[PDB]
């Protein structure tokens, strides 16, 4: 009976995902614990086409976030539109999308929605790598308390401090229609590396007001505060002698975020739906960093404010149904970057009274418009769409006295097709226009080269999704041509150089109830995810034909879940092929361990859990192991000041506990 969908991202509804005309996967809270995950990257790596490397480089700590889609640069997750409840996660979405500080926590999420394809019309910028939305816990219908905790240790490591992550959830909605939930997640501890002491406090206040069935308000308040020592990389020599140690004693990072979000929804009938959402974030991210013969301090402040009205309406036009969607977003961001320093030879860390060699202020004003129309005709669902952005960015240098500006547009036309083969089998194809902005650090290069234009990408997908209840599976191909990247892939970036890369591959995954074969395998489930990704450099120059760095060709997982009665037994494997660390693709390892072939690997993990039941508070206990065989591996950081080798996670033991009231 014609019902308007409107926001298909939202809380990642199972049905919206199945009906999604493009590559898209979701992992829900219920499945976080099975692999002992407490961090975002641990869940993201379980999704095909996604590579979320262990802490390294600038982001050599838990406050940052590292991940890349289909071979796009993983460092500081700048190639995908990262959001939490639709709200921009970056402290500078347009000018500085690098998540050196990523104020979000797994413990406060109900799910992770990765939309690799089909979201370039409604979401941006940095949409070349699809969109990733972190869905926050829902306000319980009726008063509810949930608490959980996980503890980890690496026996073979010299680091004896454990790592603990906890989460608290208390909330409910009163009969008057007003509900609010307190979501808190925290992290205390060190990983398997020395100099990794960490503290993170993520506190949110989520509210919902539905006096009636037409008017609904929503609010989200968050206070994120953290700090962490940064292990850093090791040269080959130090790594061989002791791979747990840190030779970057000064490296430390800290930051905080204050967020306020308010929204309103007007739905008169099931055919019309209006939405307006406004937000404001204040961010302070700083840290000590050893740089050459000096130690630096880099305070950076950010202000982001946005407002977005959206409208959705369905109507019949003959035998076809049309759900037209229109949206508008105004976003304004402001920044201030400073860098203090002292001589390392001296015995004091830099402070506000130390001299500084950088004092810049940047900002962006963006106007985004989008229009799409979901047309249901027969078994088809064709969706043509158009997104348009007008961006104005500037960088003001107080030391040099310069002031630079760039003004450009990003027109992105798209078309996605969904064809329903059967009640439980879909087909989809699509193409979208994606773009990367002119980052603040690239404005100088942009104006000097006289070419101010967005980083442009054109994606194409073809895939299928299946679910007969006993077997769920999906497979699809993707093609991505990403041009005019201000970051060149040549060994030497020049003013006029522009990066150009191609990403092609296959993504797939499946889950099967083996109980349909024999009662001997009842409650026995098997699964696997896999992605063949070939990211290549097609920029004319000294690296043309080479492979994009940090992009394994093969990556995925396989596992079996056995749930007899109240028990849960998990077995899982993570694997990926090798990767290069630089654009030149050098095979031979350098003495500082910053460059050279990075081996692939295959790890095994297991876990045993028990659900006690309704009375003693649905108590959940568990013990598990990551990297059972203690298989040795490592990743590298190439360009940053703490570059070098980073020991991969060794055999790690963990315990989990959770209560629900």
From Swiss-Prot:
<dbReference type="Pfam" id="PF00593">
    <property type="entry name" value="TonB_dep_Rec_b-barrel"/>
</dbReference>
<dbReference type="InterPro" id="IPR012910">
    <property type="entry name" value="Plug_dom"/>
</dbReference>
<dbReference type="InterPro" id="IPR010917">
    <property type="entry name" value="TonB_rcpt_CS"/>
</dbReference>
<dbReference type="GO" id="GO:1902495">
    <property type="term" value="C:transmembrane transporter complex"/>
</dbReference>
<dbReference type="Pfam" id="PF07715">
    <property type="entry name" value="Plug"/>
</dbReference>
<keyword id="KW-1134">Transmembrane beta strand</keyword>
<keyword id="KW-0472">Membrane</keyword>
<keyword id="KW-0408">Iron</keyword>
<comment type="similarity">
    <text>Belongs to the TonB-dependent receptor family.</text>
</comment>
<dbReference type="Pfam" id="PF07660">
    <property type="entry name" value="STN"/>
</dbReference>
<dbReference type="GO" id="GO:0038023">
    <property type="term" value="F:signaling receptor activity"/>
</dbReference>
<dbReference type="InterPro" id="IPR039426">
    <property type="entry name" value="TonB-dep_rcpt-like"/>
</dbReference>
<dbReference type="GO" id="GO:0023019">
    <property type="term" value="P:signal transduction involved in regulation of gene expression"/>
</dbReference>
<dbReference type="GO" id="GO:0006879">
    <property type="term" value="P:intracellular iron ion homeostasis"/>
</dbReference>
<dbReference type="GO" id="GO:0015343">
    <property type="term" value="F:siderophore-iron transmembrane transporter activity"/>
</dbReference>
<protein>
    <recommendedName>
        <fullName>Fe(3+) dicitrate transport protein FecA</fullName>
    </recommendedName>
</protein>
<comment type="function">
    <text>FecA is the outer membrane receptor protein in the Fe(3+) dicitrate transport system.</text>
</comment>
<dbReference type="InterPro" id="IPR000531">
    <property type="entry name" value="TonB-dep_rcpt_b-brl"/>
</dbReference>
<dbReference type="GO" id="GO:0009279">
    <property type="term" value="C:cell outer membrane"/>
</dbReference>
<dbReference type="InterPro" id="IPR010916">
    <property type="entry name" value="TonB_box_CS"/>
</dbReference>
<feature type="domain" description="TBDR plug">
    <location>
        <begin position="16"/>
        <end position="137"/>
    </location>
</feature>
<keyword id="KW-0812">Transmembrane</keyword>
<dbReference type="InterPro" id="IPR010105">
    <property type="entry name" value="TonB_sidphr_rcpt"/>
</dbReference>
<comment type="subunit">
    <text>Interacts (via periplasmic N-terminus) with FecR (via periplasmic C-terminus).</text>
</comment>
<keyword id="KW-0675">Receptor</keyword>
<dbReference type="GO" id="GO:0016020">
    <property type="term" value="C:membrane"/>
</dbReference>
<dbReference type="GO" id="GO:0033214">
    <property type="term" value="P:siderophore-dependent iron import into cell"/>
</dbReference>
<dbReference type="InterPro" id="IPR049654">
    <property type="entry name" value="FecA-like"/>
</dbReference>
<keyword id="KW-0813">Transport</keyword>
<dbReference type="InterPro" id="IPR037066">
    <property type="entry name" value="Plug_dom_sf"/>
</dbReference>
<dbReference type="InterPro" id="IPR011662">
    <property type="entry name" value="Secretin/TonB_short_N"/>
</dbReference>
<feature type="short sequence motif" description="TonB C-terminal box">
    <location>
        <begin position="644"/>
        <end position="661"/>
    </location>
</feature>
<keyword id="KW-0732">Signal</keyword>
<keyword id="KW-0410">Iron transport</keyword>
<dbReference type="InterPro" id="IPR036942">
    <property type="entry name" value="TonB_rcpt_b-brl_sf"/>
</dbReference>
<keyword id="KW-0798">TonB box</keyword>
<keyword id="KW-0406">Ion transport</keyword>
<dbReference type="GO" id="GO:1990641">
    <property type="term" value="P:response to iron ion starvation"/>
</dbReference>
<keyword id="KW-0998">Cell outer membrane</keyword>
<dbReference type="GO" id="GO:0006355">
    <property type="term" value="P:regulation of DNA-templated transcription"/>
</dbReference>
<feature type="domain" description="TBDR beta-barrel">
    <location>
        <begin position="142"/>
        <end position="661"/>
    </location>
</feature>
């Amino acid at each position: 009976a014609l019902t308007v969908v409107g926001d298909w991202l939202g809380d990642a509804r199972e049905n919206d995902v199945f009906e999604h005309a493009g590559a898209r996967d979701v992992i829900r809270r219920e499945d976080f614990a099975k692999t002992g995950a407490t961090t975002m990257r641990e869940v993201l790596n379980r999704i095909p086409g996604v590579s979320a490397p262990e802490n390294n480089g600038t982001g050599s700590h838990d406050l940052a976030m590292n991940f890349g889609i289909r071979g796009l640069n993983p460092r500081l997750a700048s190639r995908s539109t990262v959001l939490m409840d639709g709200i921009p996660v970056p402290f500078a979405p347009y000018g500085q999308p690098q998540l050196s500080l990523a104020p979000v926590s797994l413990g406060n999420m109900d799910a992770i929605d990765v939309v690799r394809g089909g979201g370039a019309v409604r979401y941006g910028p940095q949409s070349v790598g699809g969109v990733v939305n972190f869905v926050t816990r829902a306000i319980p219908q009726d008063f509810g308390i949930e608490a959980g905790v996980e503890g980890q240790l690496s026996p073979t490591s010299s680091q004896n401090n454990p790592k603990e992550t906890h989460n608290l959830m208390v909330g409910g909605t009163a009969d008057n229609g007003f509900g609010t939930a307190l979501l808190y997640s925290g992290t205390r501890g060190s990983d398997w590396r020395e100099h990794s002491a960490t503290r993170i406090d993520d506190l949110m206040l989520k509210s919902k007001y539905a006096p009636d069935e037409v008017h609904t308000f929503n609010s989200l308040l968050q206070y994120y505060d953290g700090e962490a020592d940064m292990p850093g990389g090791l040269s080959r020599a130090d790594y061989d002698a002791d791979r747990w140690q840190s030779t970057r004693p000064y490296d430390r990072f800290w930051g905080r975020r204050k967020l306020a979000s308010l929204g309103y929804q007007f739905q008169p009938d099931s055919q019309h739906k209006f939405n307006i959402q406004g937000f404001y974030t204040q961010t302070l991210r700083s840290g000590y960093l050893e740089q050459g013969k000096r130690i630096t301090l880099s305070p950076r402040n950010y202000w982001v404010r946005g407002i977005e009205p959206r409208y959705s309406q369905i109507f019949m036009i003959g035998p076809s149904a049309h759900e037209v969607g229109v949206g508008y977003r105004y976003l304004n961001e402001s920044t201030h970057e400073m860098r203090y320093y002292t001589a390392t030879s001296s015995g004091q860390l830099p402070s506000g009274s130390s001299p500084y060699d950088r004092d810049t202020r940047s900002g962006t004003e963006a106007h985004a418009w989008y229009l799409d129309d979901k047309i249901d005709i027969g078994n088809w669902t064709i969706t043509p769409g158009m997104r348009f952005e007008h961006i104005e960015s500037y960088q003001n240098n107080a030391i040099t006295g310069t002031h630079e500006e760039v003004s450009y547009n990003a027109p992105l036309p798209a078309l996605n097709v969904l064809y329903h083969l059967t009640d439980s089998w879909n087909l989809y194809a699509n193409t979208e226009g994606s773009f990367g902005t002119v980052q603040y650090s690239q404005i100088g290069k942009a104006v000097q080269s006289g070419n101010v234009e967005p980083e442009k990408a054109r994606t194409w997908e073809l895939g299928t999704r299946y679910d007969d209840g006993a077997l769920t599976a999906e497979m699809g191909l993707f093609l991505i041509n990403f041009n005019n990247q201000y970051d060149s892939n040549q060994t030497n970036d020049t003013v006029t150089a522009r990066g150009k890369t191609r990403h092609t591959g296959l993504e797939t995954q499946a889950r099967y109830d083996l109980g349909t074969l024999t009662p001997t395998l009842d409650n026995v489930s098997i699964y696997a995810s896999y992605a063949y990704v070939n990211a290549e450099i097609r920029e004319k120059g000294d690296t043309y034909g080479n492979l994009v760095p940090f992009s394994p060709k093969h990556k995925g997982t396989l596992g079996v879940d056995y749930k007899p009665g109240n028990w849960t037994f998990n077995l899982n494997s993570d694997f990926q092929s090798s990767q290069f660390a630089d654009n030149a693709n050098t095979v031979k390892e350098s003495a500082d361990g910053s460059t050279g072939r990075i081996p692939g690997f295959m790890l095994w993990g297991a876990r045993v859990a028990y659900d006690f039941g309704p009375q003693m508070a649905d108590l959940n206990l568990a013990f598990g192991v990551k990297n059972i065989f203690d298989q040795d591996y490592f990743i590298r950081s190439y360009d940053d000041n703490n570059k070098g080798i980073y020991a991969g996670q060794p055999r790690t033991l963990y315990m989990q506990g959770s209560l629900k009231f």
